[PDB]
Every structure is written in structure tokens, then in C-alpha cells.
Amino acid sequence: SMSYTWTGALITPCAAEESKLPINPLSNSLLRHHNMVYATTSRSASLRQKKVTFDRLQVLDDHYRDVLKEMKAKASTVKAKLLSIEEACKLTPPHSAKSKFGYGAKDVRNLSSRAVNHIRSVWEDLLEDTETPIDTTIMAKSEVFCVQPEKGGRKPARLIVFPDLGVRVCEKMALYDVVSTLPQAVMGSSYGFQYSPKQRVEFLVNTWKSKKCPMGFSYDTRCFDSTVTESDIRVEESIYQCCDLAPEARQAIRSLTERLYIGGPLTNSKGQNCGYRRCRASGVLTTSCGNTLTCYLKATAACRAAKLQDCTMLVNGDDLVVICESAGTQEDAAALRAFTEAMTRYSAPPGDPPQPEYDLELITSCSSNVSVAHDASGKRVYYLTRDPTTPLARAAWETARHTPINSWLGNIIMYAPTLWARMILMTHFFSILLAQEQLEKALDCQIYGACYSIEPLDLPQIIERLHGLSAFTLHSYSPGEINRVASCLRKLGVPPLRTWRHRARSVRAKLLSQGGRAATCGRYLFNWAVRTKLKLTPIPAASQLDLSGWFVAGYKGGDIYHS
Ligand SMILES: [Mg+2]
């Protein structure tokens, strides 16, 4: 069937859309080539619509059915709980999109009578009506990027599709426990969202070293959400139904599957009918779990079709990396083509054709790659890094324009050991918080799709527990990483590293001048900036903070707020 059908009504914005950095940047200090930065808007919606609209032809074989049965047997060990209205309400982010029924996220979190009474009626309606498609809103997503190195090369807006707030709270009641527990039960160590960055690199490095002769590849499915078929979504449900479930949870899942997950009408921000979806909606609770299960099922079956040997996969939503035993350069390239042909039959054709890779450091998955540096004792440390271009572009945007979600904080947390996060991101934002005395103020950021409210003065503890003490002492970065960063700073017009070393000293000195958590930030976060390096010992606070559910599951698109 067609992934989408369109009526002609436009994807419209809800308010003014900004597409460029403000006229005189609030921090030309970070980035000088302001014209390189842009944000996507609804103006490019039709370009995205063209890419994402096509007929899916899916052919399932015995390998697919075999793997599905294996997955179901593991799912059948799961017992899932229904969430109470109160528990589900508390998972709603404070700035979640308001309901058309006259209440908003604040009312949901406060358990207001209007909100709670509507949510209860939405729940009963899932039991009373098993078929009527549930309405969804379609919008163009606002995301900031740096322009392609081809003069005028811009990505079009992604299209987000989500149901009303009342429905989203009902999804949590029925499915939050399922999507939080089932993927690991089914996929075991292949489930990527159970790992912190440090644990992910460890799993990757250990997997690499376990092969007599390792070969690895990432597989990029073209527009994964659009490739998800009605069959795939019902197969996903068939896995959920293997859980022990409350009767109303079973029904809610059955109704949500047929009324929302498999497809439905698309309404624009003006309330006009835009058309019809028959693929994955980006903005429902099951999107991350569903994509991960579907990708894992198709890829695992595809490895079997391709006769890849000793495959170990790591799956994060639509992101896939596999490491296996090599059969020779020639036989690998052939196997990889067979794998791609199998994935294509399963309705997951590639964007960029995959390439066998015989150096772990050259594989990028989840936009990231493994690289190597050295700690104080000169011991080899592996860490995850990425090209810093998008993080820096978004940092510049967030410095110049007010933003609800602070991607720079998420990046500092997730990439704390990197050369660019330590020298640029940390230096830049700590100077800003220092100047405005906003240091103590908690900020919103996302980790694996879930929203968290985090105090920047807690970064030392967070980083140590997540990445290890070596995150504060890494030196001797790889030539490839140094050159990638240098090239990035050239392109964006970011001042040279040596310069950041200077600003850092000033910041470090000011932080120490304050004492307390501020002083701890000075000592640990900026020890790279001095030669007379303060000896760094494990912080007392590291081990005694609530980092429980930070790396349990993926929640991208699921409207989840943690703590
Ligand atoms: Mg893809």
C-alpha cells in the first residue's frame, strides 16, 4: 500500500517559524559563519512528502517467520503492568502539546478534573470502539543543521505525526511498561538503549575483539518510518500480546493498534484533512520500541538469508550496526549485497548502500563512532564520538534563540569525553551561565528521547558515573579525530582550540572562586585547560545519585518526561 495519500491541503505551521540565526548573533563568539546554520520549516514540507511517499511491496520468507517465532518466545516471559492515570500523567512533559479538549500538559500533571475526566473517557472509548481511526496532527519538525558542502544543500523538514494529548496519556497507561521492558527481554544484548555511552563502546569493542577476523557495517534504511507496513505493525502487536497483560490493557493495545498505530487520517494545524497515513507515526509511544523490534527482526532474518557468520547486532530504533566473522573481502561484499536484497524484500531498502568495514573506528552508528585516547596514566581509553558539526550548529542556535530543549546539555552529557565537548561546549556554556548567574538553574534536555530536567552544576558527578574518571583526563586524541574537529571549526568559523584553552582558564578561575558545586565544576571539567593539573580523585557524589532509568529504553517520539 501507499505509505501516505495526500489531499492537497498544506502542512501548515502553528506559529511563526525561524529558519535563520538572528540578525546579530547572541554569540558570534561561538560561531562566525552564521549563514551556514539553518533550521527546517514547513516551507520544505512538500520536499519531504515526496521522499516519504511510495508503495511498499513486502515479501516474507521462512527466515523472517523463524526469527519472529524466536522473538515471540522471549516476549512470552514478560509480565506487563497497567499504569494508573496518575502514573501516566506524571510522565507527561510540562510542555507537551495541549489537548483540543481545553486542557494542557500542566493540567494533566496537576491531575485537573477536566483533564483526568477526558483521559478516562478516551480510555473507555478504546474499550468501546475497536475500529474508528483516531485523528492525528501532522506538522513540520523544526531542526537545525549546517548546510551541505555543496552550496545550498539543505535537508527538508521531517514530518511529525501525533495524536491528541488525551490519547497519549492512554498510550502510557497501556504500553509504557511494555515498551520499557519488552525490547530487552526480546533482543537481549542487541538492544542498544540499555547502554550508556561507555557501556555501548564496551559492547562494541568486546564484540569486535570476539571475532577471529571482524567485519562490520552500519545499515541505513531509507526513511525507515515510511517503510513500516500494516503487517509489520500487526506483527509488532503480536509480540506485545505475548506479554501477561491486564484484560483492559490487551484491549487497549488491540484498539490502539487498529485505530492509531497502523494508520489513520492526517490533520494540519488549521484542522484541514491533509490525507492518510499507512505507515509508522513518528509521535506515538510505540515508535522507538516498534522500530527497534522491526529493524531487529528484518535484519536478523536478513543475516540468515545472507549467510553472514557469527553476527552480533546492535539496534537503536531504525539504527543498525552488525559485526560478524569475515569470509574474505570478496565474499563479504557479496554477502552484504545479499543482506541488502533480503532487507529490501522485507520492505527496508537502503539509503546509502552499506559497506563492509574492517576497522571498528570507521563504522558510524547512531551518528557515532568509537575512537581512542589516553588517560592520565597513558592507558588506552575507548570512547564514543561524532562529527561535531550538528552539535555546534545547534549550540549556536540555542545561544542566540530561546529554546525549550537544550541539546548542548544532552551533548555534553553523552559526549563528555570528546575533544569538542570538553573544550568548546563546556567552555562556552559555562561562561554564559556564569555571566547571567544561571548556573544553579535546572535545564531540560533529552536522553534517548526522554526529557530530563538537569542542573548543570551536577555535570561532574553525572560525567564521572557515566564515562569514568578518565573523562576528565583524556589526552592524545587520534589524528583522525583531531582533523575532523579542526575541519569542522574551519567550516563553521569557530575559534581555534588554543583559544578555548584561554577562555576555559578564565571560566575555571571564576568557578573555583565560587566554591561548592561550582568549584567542583572548575576542578574537574576544566583540568584539561591547565598544565599544573589538579590531581583528580573520585567525587563523593558519584555513586549516590539517581541514574536509574537513564539507559533502560528508547522513547523518541513518545512524549516521555522522566522525574
Ligand atoms: Mg535510515
UniProtKB/Swiss-Prot annotation:
Subcellular location: Host cytoplasm; Host endoplasmic reticulum membrane
Activity regulation description: Activity is up-regulated by PRK2/PKN2-mediated phosphorylation.
Binding residue positions for Mg(2+) 2: 220, 318-319
Cofactor note: Binds 2 magnesium ion that constitute a dinuclear catalytic metal center.
Domain RdRp catalytic: start-end pairs: 214-332
Membrane protein topology class: Single-pass type IV membrane protein
Highest rank taxon of the organism: Viruses
Cofactors: Mg(2+)
Record's catalysed reaction(s): RNA(n) + a ribonucleoside 5'-triphosphate = RNA(n+1) + diphosphate
PTM description: The N-terminus is phosphorylated by host PRK2/PKN2.
Phosphoserine modifications at: 29, 42
Subunit structure: Homooligomer. Interacts with non-structural protein 5A. Interacts with host VAPB. Interacts with host PRK2/PKN2. Interacts with host HNRNPA1 and SEPT6; these interactions facilitate viral replication. Part of the replication complex composed of NS2, NS3, NS4A, NS4B, NS5A and the RNA-directed RNA polymerase.
Function: RNA-dependent RNA polymerase that performs primer-template recognition and RNA synthesis during viral replication. Initiates RNA transcription/replication at a flavin adenine dinucleotide (FAD), resulting in a 5'- FAD cap on viral RNAs. In this way, recognition of viral 5' RNA by host pattern recognition receptors can be bypassed, thereby evading activation of antiviral pathways.
Stated name of the protein: RNA-directed RNA polymerase
Organism: Hepatitis C virus genotype 1b (strain HC-J4) (HCV)
Species lineage: Viruses, Riboviria, Orthornavirae, Kitrinoviricota, Flasuviricetes
